[PDB]
Amino acid sequence: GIVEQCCTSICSLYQLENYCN
């Protein structure tokens, strides 16, 4: 999930927080 979205396009800190515990 994080692969396709944060590798093909640049993910913000806001988008990356969705993958935290």
Ligand X SMILES: COC(=O)c1ccc(O)cc1
Of 8 and 21, which CB lies nearer to ligand X in the complex structure?
8
Binding status of residue 10 toward ligand X by CB under 6 A: yes
Residues 1-21 that bind other proteins (CB under 8 A): 2-3, 6-8, 11, 13, 16-17, 19-21
Residue 1 neighbours by CB under 8 Å, 6+ apart: 19
Q: Is the dihedral of CA 11, 15, 18, 21 positive or negative?
A: positive
Tokens of 12: 């913000």
Tokens of 7: 């590798």
Tell me, by CB under 6 A, how many residues bind ligand X. 3
Interacting residues with other proteins (CB under 8 A)? 2-3, 6-8, 11, 13, 16-17, 19-21
